[PDB]
Amino acid sequence: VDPRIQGELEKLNQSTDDINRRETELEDARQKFRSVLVEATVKLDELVKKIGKAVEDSKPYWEARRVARQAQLEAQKATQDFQRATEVLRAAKETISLAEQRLLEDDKRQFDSAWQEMLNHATQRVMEAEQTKTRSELVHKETAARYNAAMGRMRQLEKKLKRAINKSKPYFELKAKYYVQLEQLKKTVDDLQAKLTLAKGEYKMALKNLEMISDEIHERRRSS
Amino acid sequence: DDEYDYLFKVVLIGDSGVGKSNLLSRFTRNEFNLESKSTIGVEFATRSIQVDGKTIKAQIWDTAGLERYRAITSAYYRGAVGALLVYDIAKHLTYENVERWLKELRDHADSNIVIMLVGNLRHLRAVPTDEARAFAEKNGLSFIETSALDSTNVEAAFQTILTEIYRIVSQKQMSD
């Protein structure tokens, strides 16, 4: 008679409607993205026309502010890494032998690697924890210096371009807003695209197991 | 290659003695490698065109003419937006059973689908073209007859029914 045909058929003509629905939603999302981008460009352009040339030559300042924020974030991450490195160090020192502790701390003049053969073997993990800690402190101070450089730079550029920056604030503020909205709508478009592709995948799969049923009937009829 | 804008379901119905598979085989890219009518009961085949700037991918569900054990007709007609009722211009029994197949459509398909009646060298005129044309006119259906050597009007038929379906769905979308 017939086995599993009806269920996969129903799944197929359901995945049709699912595909059409997801596609319509995706196209509406694309349209909203387009109209928002157009509106953004024309509004920003007219704001440039009514604000003047301050926006253009005040552009290096806002760039210096961007690199300053990045140097800040990178500095924070490096400070975190330093902290966790330090806790690893002290937790390693919890292997006590307090005499050996200040043997490492008091002077690394001539550690003489042959002493490790004579004392606790758990000094190696302590010592390499000290190494990773000292390097993490290096990157910590380095990124701190980068942050201070970017900060002072953006401030002297600020005092060089004070009038232009204050006159150009609304353009860059509105442009920021439009950019946020654009990335949100683009996220929506991408997610709807993924839903659509998944629906088409379900369709293709139901079709594939349907012709799988047909092929299983092929060899069954081939037995003769 | 799944890049398209709409997906429309079109069913192929009518009397079995018309041989729809050979007019289909010219334009349809069968998705399976073996006959799906004797095994599954329906033979799928997909065709894509372009209408009004958008891409229309329509999948054709073929036959189920051996309806001796086809309790799958509920799923076979569900969701379909297009229907092709194919009869032979050399047989009158097919043209008489067109009413029966229309009953099957009204019983199992949606009440807003686009239906088109299609009429398919040695035999001479059994169905007058004007009679079938007036029949499709009184029943609110499209109509185009075509043979297998000059298959222009079947392509124009596909583009016609698909274009009408796109018109319906676009008019539905323009009322949001």
Residue numbers in the entry:
A (entry chain C): 41 to 264
B (entry chain A): 5 to 124, 128 to 183
What does the paper say about this structure?
Rab GTPases act as molecular switches and cycle between a GDP “off” state and a GTP-bound “on” state. The Rab11 proteins are master regulators of the surface expression of receptors. The mammalian ortholog of REI-1, SH3-binding protein 5 (SH3BP5), also has GEF activity toward Rab11 and was shown to be selective for Rab11 over Rab526. Detailed biochemical studies reveal that SH3BP5 is highly selective for Rab11 isoforms, with no activity toward any of the most evolutionarily similar Rab GTPases.
To understand the molecular basis of how SH3BP5 mediates Rab11A nucleotide exchange, we determined the structure of the N-terminal GEF domain of SH3BP5 bound to full-length Q70L Rab11A to a final resolution of 3.1 Å. The Q70L construct of Rab11 was used for structural studies as the marginally increased GEF rate for Q70L vs. WT suggested Q70L might form a slightly more stable complex with SH3BP5. The structure is composed of four complexes of SH3BP5-Rab11A per asymmetric unit, with each of the copies in the asymmetric unit sharing an overall similar architecture. The GEF domain of SH3BP5 is composed of a coiled coil that is kinked to form an overall v-shape. The v is composed of four long α-helices (α1–α4), with a small helix connecting helices α2 α3. Nucleotide-free Rab11A was bound to the GEF domain of SH3BP5 at one end of the v at a surface composed of the N terminus of helix α1 and the C terminus of helix α4 of the coiled coil. The SH3BP5-Rab11 interface is composed of a large extended, primarily hydrophobic interface (~1250 Å2). Comparison of the structure of nucleotide-free Rab11A bound to SH3BP5 compared with Rab11A bound to either GDP or GTP reveals an extensive rearrangement of switch I41, with only limited conformational changes in switch II. The main difference is in the conformation of F36 and I44 in Rab11. These residues pack directly against each other, which requires a constrained conformation of switch I. This constrained orientation of the highly conserved F36 and I44 residues is unique compared with previously solved Rab-GEF structures.
